[PDB]
Amino acid sequence: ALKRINRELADLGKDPPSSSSAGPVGDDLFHWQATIMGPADSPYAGGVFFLSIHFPTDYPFKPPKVNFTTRIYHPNINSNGSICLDILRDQWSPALTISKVLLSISSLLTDPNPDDPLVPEIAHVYKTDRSRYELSAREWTRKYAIG
Amino acid sequence: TIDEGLYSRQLYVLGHEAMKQMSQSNVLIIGCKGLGVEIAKNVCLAGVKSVTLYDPQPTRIEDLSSQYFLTEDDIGVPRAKVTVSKLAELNQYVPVSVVDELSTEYLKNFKCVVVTETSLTKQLEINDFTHKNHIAYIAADSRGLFGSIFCDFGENFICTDTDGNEPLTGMIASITDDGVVTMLEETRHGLENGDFVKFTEVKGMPGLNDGTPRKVEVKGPYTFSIGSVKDLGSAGYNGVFTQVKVPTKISFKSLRESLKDPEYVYPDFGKMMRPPQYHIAFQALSAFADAHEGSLPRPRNDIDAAEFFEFCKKIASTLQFDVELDEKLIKEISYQARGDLVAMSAFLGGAVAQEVLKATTSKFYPLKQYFYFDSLESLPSSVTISEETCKPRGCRYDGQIAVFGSEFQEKIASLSTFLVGAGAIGCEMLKNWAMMGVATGESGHISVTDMDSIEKSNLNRQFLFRPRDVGKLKSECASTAVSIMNPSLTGKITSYQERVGPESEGIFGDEFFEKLSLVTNALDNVEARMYVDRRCVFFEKPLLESGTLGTKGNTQVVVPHLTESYGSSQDPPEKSFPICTLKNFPNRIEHTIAWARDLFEGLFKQPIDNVNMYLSSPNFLETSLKTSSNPREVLENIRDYLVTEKPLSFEECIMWARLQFDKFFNNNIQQLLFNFPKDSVTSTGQPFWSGPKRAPTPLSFDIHNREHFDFIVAAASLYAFNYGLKSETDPAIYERVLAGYNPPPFAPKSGIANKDKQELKSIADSLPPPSSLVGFRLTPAEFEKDDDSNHHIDFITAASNLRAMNYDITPADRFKTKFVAGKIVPAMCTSTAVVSGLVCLELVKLVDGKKKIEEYKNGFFNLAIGLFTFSDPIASPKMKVNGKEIDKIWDRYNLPDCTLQELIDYFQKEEGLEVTMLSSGVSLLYANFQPPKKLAERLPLKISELVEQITKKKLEPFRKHLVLEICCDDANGEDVEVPFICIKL
Amino acid sequence: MQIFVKTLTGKTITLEVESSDTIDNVKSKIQDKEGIPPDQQRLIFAGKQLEDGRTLSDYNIQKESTLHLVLRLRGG
């Protein structure tokens, strides 16, 4: 696991992710702290979201545990930071890199999926009153994702 | 009336009906040697109605080679008489008897008849009777490293289950007018051509819901066909399908008929020409015994071998067998005629016991009809095996010396093994080692470790433990039992109660491991397997891995510098459901059981832990306010469980349980339906509650309903346990308390600054001070499935069934709920016996020090279908480093405790490689991209000092080495893999 | 060429292959028909475990040959 994790880290260092920056916490290779920038064409524009990534002892044969640490008002992210992503629960394979996961999370942020929601109330607000959802998302990203 | 406290693991393999039929079947066993006693033990543990033994032959010393119920004080006593008393203790529900004489008509009292150590004429005489009276007949034989099984269940055997798999079920998406059934998105039905299915809940085609099975024509992994459904309708939508398993009729031939034209079962496809040879060889053995007053050929005797081969020629000519006899193999069968190995006995006994259970239950596919097996690759080649070394010495190991010799006996007697785990496989392994004489020499020793204690359910397949041993440590009991079996092991066994893992390296350290000869795993989880595999790889010790699951099993061997390790291959992972499915949209009972388990943890475990930690840690609040993802939840839990909702009697517990019922089965559903009404549609215009999403309906509490009352009782009892109150079970108090309950009004909420922190502070300071409460603690509930009086499984079952009623899912019972929630692994005694036999057959290969990789076999088997297969181990991969051949697995660098700069310089000058990353454990000691100041600080330090500084933990005094992982690049910049580094402290 | 694969659970699978196909192609076909990733498949023919990077003709696998698809178990 150590060699794979270091290879991914070096690959990140070589070619910058531009919109993301993940690295080990202190000197522990199995605990990373990543950062994601809110897409410009989204309610979360101009926001910095911190994620915690926990590689299991069996990596890459078990998915990393990725949790948001910043509060976000999204139909697919709940108060614990859990992310409704298929590739993190049962579709995980030992061929996906952390950069792919970060790109998937950014794409999820750019457009939510209210048809299979994790937070039914936010999904209902999104489906019925879109403008209120936009205002709430902007308020939350200004209150938590900036500073 | 099956005692589920004992047959818990076996019922998950067989079932209630199968065991009900088993409990009414009688088994007769002729022969009480190692094979016979193994079969009888497995049958008694299985749970047949009764067992009868017939063996009037007086005991002899050599019989102790594989008979573990015989002692040296029983010489001259009939074997059955001395074995019945010890067999009667294995299971209290299975009487064991002895008959001094056998008459043909007496056979009519038995459901199954097993025959061992009997001549062919007697077998023909018995089978001529059993066949025409419809009695299952099994005949087993074990000669040295060769074995044979024959089954004859009658001309009209009815098999109800042919593979032992659960019926397949699936969710449909659409059924066209031509019967083309399509599965949901990316879902496989798993059917085969010729299967039968029945449909339910199909809309648009009500005619398919009657329940008549229909033929299945598989057209792809996602679709199949059922025929023409023109009349029933035009097109069907949604619904579910379930496979229907139909009985089969199997016709067996009598032994007399099948001798001429046998039907073979092949345990190995690599040698398909052998079973025809063994068929002649075993008959020749019987003829030779008949011609010499029942005496088999003497060990490694050439005259007897020649006469035996003459008999083989005669038999082959008589039967018009157009097969060329392999002289070497047949004479090998002759040489080992008097062999009696405990490993072969265990293997064949497990197989034959499974066949007996098939006969008595009409389940699983039986052997049809001849099963000839050999493990001739285990014959030693590093020692002298001749007539002089194989002659008997008048000791209990004669049956083994007749195959391996005295020099190999000396080799076995000085082994130093290490057995990890003392479960079913551990007990079988200890028995096999005791019988084989392992570690009975001056320099021998056995070490066994296991941190668990004996429980009632373990007695069903761990025959070394008795009911009086419940509550004691497994390792001590196993060591004492095997010291009773073989007295020479007194003082040669050491038992530890230590878990093998990173925390026990102070006991199983360098000194402990350097003295071993091999390691044998008997574990039940993959983490321990991987850890022990890594330790064996580091210390370069042979490893024997084995595993079982229901009727399936496998065994693998890891040999230093020859094969790959256990961790070089990948296994399928456990399936975990998406959080969105469990939280809101379940459609299977497994989802509701997982939800109920999470609810149990969140109601009776987490709040109690938070309250207790608040009353112990002086700085708990501040740490929680910035550590947890929801400090508000922690504060609310503490407040509710300390002041707001602290019960003073059991009536308040009942009221709390009623409130929780409302919270989790009536109000959350109302909120969910407020967010997504049943008539809502998706963004594409499709209905929202279609397919995998089922529309729920709120539950209204009714005291008379059984599930509601069960939930109330279990929740109130668990809450009282948390607060230490006196619970009750009389329905009168529950009905009286719940009558006067006024539900608070509830209305779903439509929704519509920094003061929240002030509110959190106000809540925090409102809590009573820890000083005011000293010595006060709340007892958390620790999940325990094996106790049927703590209400854990009762609560989980009630919650799961209530949530199933919410979403219109078919509820399950306590049996299936315990199976799913407890992560129980089905277990059988027969599979354990087979795997132990295979492992002990590989152990002799390891002891002999075989070098070629084609001489070892990894084994896989499924007894439900009678499948056995073997394959050579995979050789360890090689690589080129600096123009040198390096083993990717078993090679390492040995360096002194130098500085980091010196290590880098050594790798640059010696291997011509540039070090880019260096890590130890879970820490990054050095990386090429670190800032220059940090490196300049870390460069002149020794590796031990660097590890201590980075990990912030001093190395223990017992630590004698460090393992480092290094990634380096060549001169051109291409990354080259290198083996790990072993720094000697 | 047509070959058969028998699973440890009793299922049978029919594959249409050629003698020149690599073991990787066979594993991919088995994944298509069963969903088992190639890295988790253990194929046995005539007492030899098939390894990636080689061809069928290396193992003398001819038409109507029977392979066994096996797996390890964690109990015990």
Add this chain to the structure above:
Amino acid sequence: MQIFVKTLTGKTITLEVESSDTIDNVKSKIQDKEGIPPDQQRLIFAGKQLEDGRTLSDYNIQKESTLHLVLRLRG
């Protein structure tokens, strides 16, 4: 030519296509008409699932053939 695509709810969509048209183009037409992303469209004909990168002629789709459209939902 013309073809018909039936959905899980009983709706029928008529499409004007050619035997040489790729599956991707047909999925693009279905996305333009119904708004369903191609990645979530699962088209089935005669018990076989249509795969991207191929053409209708590869599946022997002819005049006025009938397909079935189901949808997979991202988790």
